[PDB]
Amino acid sequence: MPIRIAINGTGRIGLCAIRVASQRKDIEIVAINSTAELETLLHLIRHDSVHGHFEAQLNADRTLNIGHSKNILVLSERDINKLDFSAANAEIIIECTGKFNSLEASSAHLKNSVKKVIISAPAQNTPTFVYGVNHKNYHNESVISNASCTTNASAPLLKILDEAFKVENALLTTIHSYTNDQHKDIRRARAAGLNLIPTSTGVSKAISLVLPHLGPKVTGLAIRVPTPNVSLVDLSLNFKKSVSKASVQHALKDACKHAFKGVVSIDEERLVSSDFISSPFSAIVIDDQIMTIGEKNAKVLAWYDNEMGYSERLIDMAQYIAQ
Template identity: 35%
Template sequence: MWKVPVTQKPDQCLGEWIDREALAEAMIPLIGQLYRNNNVVTSIYGRSLINRSVIELLKAHRFARHRQADSHELSVHETFPLLKAMSELKLGAASVDLGKLAVKFKTDGNGRSAEAFVREELGPVVGQQNVGERKGTDVVLYGFGRIGRLLARILIEKAGGGDGLRLRAVVVRKGASNDLAKRASLLRRDSVHGSFDGIIHVDEEANTLTVNGNLIQFIYAKSPTEVDYTQYGISNALLVDNTGVWRDAEGLGQHLTCPGIDRVLLTAPGKGKLKNIVHGINHGDITADDKIVSAASCTTNAIVPVLKAVNDKFGIVNGHVETVHSYTNDQNLIDNFHKGDRRGRSAALNMVITETGAATAAAKALPELAGKLTGNAIRVPTPNVSMAILNLNLEKASSREEMNEYLRYMALHSDLSRQIDFVASQEVVSTDFVGSRYAGVVDAEATICNDNRVVLYVWYDNEFGYSCQVVRVMEDMAGVNPPAFPQ
């Protein structure tokens, strides 16, 4: 009878698991202290470690193998010493990717201790705890729909010690006598993104929600011009318009006439001369004089970082972008009148061909692509996660292996590592990308290369991934974007 060779014994496997659990458990208070006391946000290849459980920390380490060339599984034995060293260096505000830091320590440590390595790598923020004045920036959300509520979740998650972006108010039209309770319920429960990770207290009399200690004033108004935000103690605020009702400088400028509002960010493609910002690409174009800025669209944010990466190395002659996009609230649930072509047909029952301005908008963020791209979209019966198919003709020929390796490198080591993710699995489907914090995720197994022609498939969470990009633009506009390490 053939016997299966056994390399490990059950007790050994369990013992190793318990050991990893113990180390992950020891990491939790260190992560929390760095976050609350030092405003240091830790992650592993883009996966936030704030307020995570033991198993979630271990899964984040396991996930890291997909980002390594050798499929190496990151171990808590590698990250814990670095985290411990960080907790003892009185760090100033920073964003630290422990996964990348551990890999760099492994390859470039050169015999140094964890403490010596971390001290050098994080040198600019070592000893900077509570040095210099960091004042929180008030934030107002104008509208509380899909994007507004996700922005609220992210802002609350990133509140830290309160000297970054501080969500102070939400402006909506009153929809019912129990409006606030309904708004709280929608924030608490989400059919796509799951339950809110926190505690929400409702004060109907004061029209406030207290969410994980953050007091949020709900203001009921029918137009931007009728609100005086200073009455609520709000000043020099950054207002984020999620409604999409106004998309040009004139319409959005109404917000700037309100006492307490200093700058405005639109979560839709801007019209006219408004700057359309894709973080990671042209966020450096934001100046102190820019009072109104657009964060472009979810699709533009998904495709532009990948397009820039490809164009920088291979050159793009021309191409076509086809978006397979989840349906949105703009479409009808069942057939009914709609002013837009085809959008009146049931979103839940049909694939619907519609237009997209993403290809044209890409040139606003990346002018070298002007006139080179066409685009179209197909709305499909899924509630979230979309895909952009980039069919490109290149100046330089490439192979599938070369293209994938290059994009993997860009996802790991470039300035676009917060925008581009990379997955090499033949089993992933759209729901696997719900909650992705990246602008777009390159599906390596779907890449097609034929001489000078390449077809790339890019997944994106058109709600949450886009919202993360919006918050990054907000941080830049407010001047509260901490340095990222390793550099």
Template identity: 30%
Template structure:
């Protein structure tokens, strides 16, 4: 098949909208829209490779040995069906992050969601999965039959929620438990998943004490070991801040930094004023801009010791349901121009951090980040320099979707390492 034929065939395998393709692949919906218009005549081989992967195929460039470039008109391809053992996943917690993880991965041939544990009743779990106020209704039909979600030839058992250790993960032959409750952050608590038969635990919050590893893709994913059993993926804010700091430091050097994350409200904030131990967070989430603490600087400094004592920050929770940003102010070793800064992020988005960093020159706002599969969306129009002393950069992010994608990618990385 040529590029156009391959593109059309892959589209037929997953009847998604361009928005769904973007969420599943990290490739922009505009790219899919443009390629649809000309039936894939100008589609890039890299796009076909990513599409093939999510459809369960390996893209083979059959005439590469003849010196034909994969993006040439005469390039020819075959699709080989991937035959691999699926990663058996148990979800512990089915809130926003848990549901995003399921939506991203349930139709992916690499993953099998065996069981989900949550405090909610099964009807509510199914209802909130199918009808999301931010990401919309699901296109595919997923039925609830008794205590099972049924979709295609697959099923997922829904289990009552409780504390770690209450679910016999070994009875379900689980490869990895993803704890997305946000409630359990110590080794002692998370170890109970292991004691109940989980082979590995990924937790979607930064830990309180020592665990086996903290991982941020683009920063230290190459350091993971098969012996790691309890791993934190930090938080969406921490991941964005780490990537911004890395790009700026690698290119120009950072002396010190101050960050503000302007963050969508979260599910633990009240809609109306209500008693909370944190007085500021006792105020209405939809009526106020609320100053809040953030863990992000501390964990970035932990993973990147060169920033120890050089970075601090604050969070401001604002009355939007999704779409957040980091406003980062840095004092540089060498002050670049605005053009140099933007070029450094643009280069990273197409090289070593492709798929994690997206770059735009559009005049975007917070809702434009919703549904993005990348970790961060760099806003080149917001880059500023003050008195040749301070640099300001801004990056947007969906505070659930891209983060959920990174969790699944990390689960796959550990499984590949173990099966190698």
């Protein structure tokens, strides 16, 4: 029987999760909770400025029909304590509202038929997993976090490169595309659309949750830029083992054939950011721009769609934790 999931929240990540989940034969979306009116929700599923058009229909009984999910109940309840996914017999909640990003808050979902919650964001006090990095450490936790799009891109690369060459230290800069991004930090009060905006983002702590040995050896920051969706991570690494451009390229390519198949990819075609809109990978390595200096240092860049790679991992994690 397909895994019965419900999506809570229909911002960008929730909408992408709907699209992704609808294409998986081992998933049934049984319910969506949205603040939008039904026809607005249908509109936003069908039409997207970056991801294009998508087929979705309304059934006669005003459930939705999308891909393999032919009978999706639509709810509109803001209060998590009143919200009741029981009529749809949901087993896993994908928590995409941004309002309950903690263990205590999202635990309010655990009632009736619901067994598990995956939070689509970093979350306070919450066991955190990145698919391909530490997801096999999962041990039946009922509320988990899928981390951030940034960590989903950088943690796979760090793991691959540490296994090959042994990371001594690394500095990460994320060029974070935020046109579609819907703090004690004064720069967050300034116009996203007109500016490059450097931001601290808790890189060391994030990495520590999924790669505990590396957390203390890495740090970095983000530069928010006014383009949509496709972001880049730039890792500057110092290794124990000597490296060349070729050896770094070969280590990354080998990983994509094996342990990170379907999660990390290599671009050998010299493409640009817009070519990776809607890419399902967590990271796409820019093969020709790998460089080394001295014996022990390298720079590695990788693209990612900050919605679609993440959302593909979200649903991968739902299938995994359902077993």
